[PDB]
Design a protein around this ligand. Sequence first.
Ligand SMILES: [Mg+2]
Ligand SMILES: [Mg+2]
Ligand SMILES: [Mg+2]
Ligand SMILES: [Mg+2]
Ligand SMILES: [Mg+2]
Ligand SMILES: [Mg+2]
Ligand SMILES: [Mg+2]
Ligand SMILES: [Mg+2]
Ligand SMILES: [Mg+2]
Ligand SMILES: [Mg+2]
Ligand SMILES: [Mg+2]
Ligand SMILES: [Mg+2]
Ligand SMILES: [Mg+2]
Ligand SMILES: [Mg+2]
Ligand SMILES: [Mg+2]
Ligand SMILES: [Mg+2]
Ligand SMILES: [Mg+2]
Ligand SMILES: [Mg+2]
Ligand SMILES: [Mg+2]
Ligand SMILES: [Mg+2]
Ligand SMILES: [Mg+2]
Ligand SMILES: [Mg+2]
Ligand SMILES: [Mg+2]
Ligand SMILES: [Mg+2]
Ligand SMILES: [Mg+2]
Ligand SMILES: [Mg+2]
Ligand SMILES: [Mg+2]
Ligand SMILES: [Mg+2]
Ligand SMILES: [Mg+2]
Ligand SMILES: [Mg+2]
Ligand SMILES: [Mg+2]
Ligand SMILES: [Mg+2]
Ligand SMILES: [Mg+2]
Ligand SMILES: [Mg+2]
Ligand SMILES: [Mg+2]
Ligand SMILES: [Mg+2]
Ligand SMILES: [Mg+2]
Ligand SMILES: [Mg+2]
Ligand SMILES: [Mg+2]
Ligand SMILES: [Mg+2]
Ligand SMILES: [Mg+2]
Lengths: 87, 70, 116, 101
Amino acid sequence: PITKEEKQKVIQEFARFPGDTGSTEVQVALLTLRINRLSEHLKVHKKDHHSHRGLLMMVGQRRRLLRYLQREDPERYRALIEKLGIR
Amino acid sequence: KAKVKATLGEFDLRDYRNVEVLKRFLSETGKILPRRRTGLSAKEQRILAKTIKRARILGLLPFTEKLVRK
Amino acid sequence: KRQVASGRAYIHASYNNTIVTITDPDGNPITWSSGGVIGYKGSRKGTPYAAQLAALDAAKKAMAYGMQSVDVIVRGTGAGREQAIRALQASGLQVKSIVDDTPVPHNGCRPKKKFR
Amino acid sequence: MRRYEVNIVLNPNLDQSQLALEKEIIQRALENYGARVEKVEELGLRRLAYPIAKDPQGYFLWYQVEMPEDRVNDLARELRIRDNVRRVMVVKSQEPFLANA
RNA sequence: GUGGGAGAGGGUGGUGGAAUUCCCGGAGUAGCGGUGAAAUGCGCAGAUACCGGGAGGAACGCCGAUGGCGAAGGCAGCCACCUGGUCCACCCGUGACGCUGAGGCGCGAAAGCGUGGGGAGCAAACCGGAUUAGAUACCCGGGUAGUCCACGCCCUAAACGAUGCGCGCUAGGUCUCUGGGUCUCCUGGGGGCCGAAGCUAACGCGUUAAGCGCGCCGCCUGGGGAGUACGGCCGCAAGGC
Ligand SMILES: [Mg+2]
Ligand SMILES: [Mg+2]
Ligand SMILES: [Mg+2]
Ligand SMILES: [Mg+2]
Ligand SMILES: [Mg+2]
Ligand SMILES: [Mg+2]
Ligand SMILES: [Mg+2]
Ligand SMILES: [Mg+2]
Ligand SMILES: [Mg+2]
Ligand SMILES: [Mg+2]
Ligand SMILES: [Mg+2]
Ligand SMILES: [Mg+2]
Ligand SMILES: [Mg+2]
Ligand SMILES: [Mg+2]
Ligand SMILES: [Mg+2]
Ligand SMILES: [Mg+2]
Ligand SMILES: [Mg+2]
Ligand SMILES: [Mg+2]
Ligand SMILES: [Mg+2]
Ligand SMILES: [Mg+2]
Ligand SMILES: [Mg+2]
Ligand SMILES: [Mg+2]
Ligand SMILES: [Mg+2]
Ligand SMILES: [Mg+2]
Ligand SMILES: [Mg+2]
Ligand SMILES: [Mg+2]
Ligand SMILES: [Mg+2]
Ligand SMILES: [Mg+2]
Ligand SMILES: [Mg+2]
Ligand SMILES: [Mg+2]
Ligand SMILES: [Mg+2]
Ligand SMILES: [Mg+2]
Ligand SMILES: [Mg+2]
Ligand SMILES: [Mg+2]
Ligand SMILES: [Mg+2]
Ligand SMILES: [Mg+2]
Ligand SMILES: [Mg+2]
Ligand SMILES: [Mg+2]
Ligand SMILES: [Mg+2]
Ligand SMILES: [Mg+2]
Ligand SMILES: [Mg+2]
């Protein structure tokens, strides 16, 4: 799955500063990893429909945070998207 | 009548391998007793059910037995 | 022509009939009777009187082969399932033990419309 | 790597030539799948609750290991291959939940 | 975020015993079955009942609950892998990023359809036997599609809590599941029962609102005609909106 080892590796990479656990950049980073953990789980197991629902809620939440970042500071949005290869 | 947990020690509820204690929770048949006769709690009985089923597959507890009466 | 003198007796009691088989301790039968072996023909077979007479017919048949000790096995519920047991203890055959082995499935086969 | 428990019941009629073979075969299968064995308990001749393979008894083994998770079901497949091997039950380890404590 | 927690949540593979059917052998005579009674049916080519061995498919007894999970449909052997939702303790982080939601898209019991399998039990149609005034039925014996699996359609329902979602507020008592806690109890989050104020036409609802409010969507305007006609979109068709 997703262990706390791999978890901290992402938080410290996208932290705006030491100790930051809840920045918009960090949330989108964390959300996007479970996106890829699930989308690669759904390439196989195409008949797993109940897990398909949780994926739609993660994308909606990821785009909800990105649409917010767009409005406040558009630069860090581009620095984030280019760093995650989205859109 | 007495209840099983009442007359018993401090035991591992997740140990499927201890037949001696698991034989106490089976009836005359291989059936699993209701909570009323075991004196267990909600979460306890749910663990016992699964651990007995484990012992059944290992051939340690019987699936069913024969009643000697009537 | 066997001289068994000990063995098992299976009572298969249904609501339409009660039937008794007498076997040796290995399970292989010796003689047997039922509600139809005695004169009864129709619904009269699943009655406690027929169950009693069928049990006692097999018992006397087992006396020919010399049965004395008898272990009793019972399968199914039916009118006269108990009247067959009671008939067997007083049949002269010393009854060793009585066991109920009625097979109960683990919900594996779909029953007929009657049973649902 | 998570921690598991292995239960193996085999035919309780083996001499030492076949018993050592069957078990060192199990050792060989654990090596090939990366099972770090933490401890072992051997019960052996034990009265079964119902006939298994027409035999009223079974020879019991128990191993506690730590191995990668993805390889478990292929390890279970590798153990039931042996004819003498009859029962193979692999359970993820759990805490000894106490009752009437 | 961190640390814990419960679960028939899902998918994949694997696997265990009970039972039915069928085959093989042993043993064993004269009927079994079935009903309010019976008859078709099966049985001397030896059935039923008993023991043993084997095959196959489907469903998981007890635990099991007025219980749990899920958005709804719905989800019960056990094991493992992948995996989703959710809840609690800390008061750590971002700093209104929120709610609803016409379209769209995805899910959607059962039945039905296509291709290929599978086929034990059950069983529309149908073949029989009875009952009857008649039996195109209930009861009985057989029995195909189908039920199961894979892949693709179909989009209906008493899809029910006949109660859309989210939030705030408004006496309690009691039963319960699961967490935490200074663990007669307190404190949360669900699942039940009584009931304050109040609402309601009444039955009844009543911190899980049908109460007091607020935001947004869906929908209603007499019955039959009629969920029919026409048109359109969708569908292989049945037919659906
Ligand atoms: Mg009769
Ligand atoms: Mg084997
Ligand atoms: Mg599950
Ligand atoms: Mg599953
Ligand atoms: Mg034969
Ligand atoms: Mg005849
Ligand atoms: Mg004939
Ligand atoms: Mg004939
Ligand atoms: Mg003939
Ligand atoms: Mg076949
Ligand atoms: Mg029940
Ligand atoms: Mg719920
Ligand atoms: Mg329902
Ligand atoms: Mg989980
Ligand atoms: Mg703070
Ligand atoms: Mg702060
Ligand atoms: Mg600040
Ligand atoms: Mg929403
Ligand atoms: Mg919509
Ligand atoms: Mg559907
Ligand atoms: Mg279907
Ligand atoms: Mg089909
Ligand atoms: Mg039938
Ligand atoms: Mg029929
Ligand atoms: Mg009439
Ligand atoms: Mg007629
Ligand atoms: Mg209405
Ligand atoms: Mg409203
Ligand atoms: Mg507590
Ligand atoms: Mg509550
Ligand atoms: Mg009032
Ligand atoms: Mg009420
Ligand atoms: Mg409310
Ligand atoms: Mg109203
Ligand atoms: Mg309308
Ligand atoms: Mg009108
Ligand atoms: Mg219609
Ligand atoms: Mg028109
Ligand atoms: Mg049309
Ligand atoms: Mg067309
Ligand atoms: Mg229609």
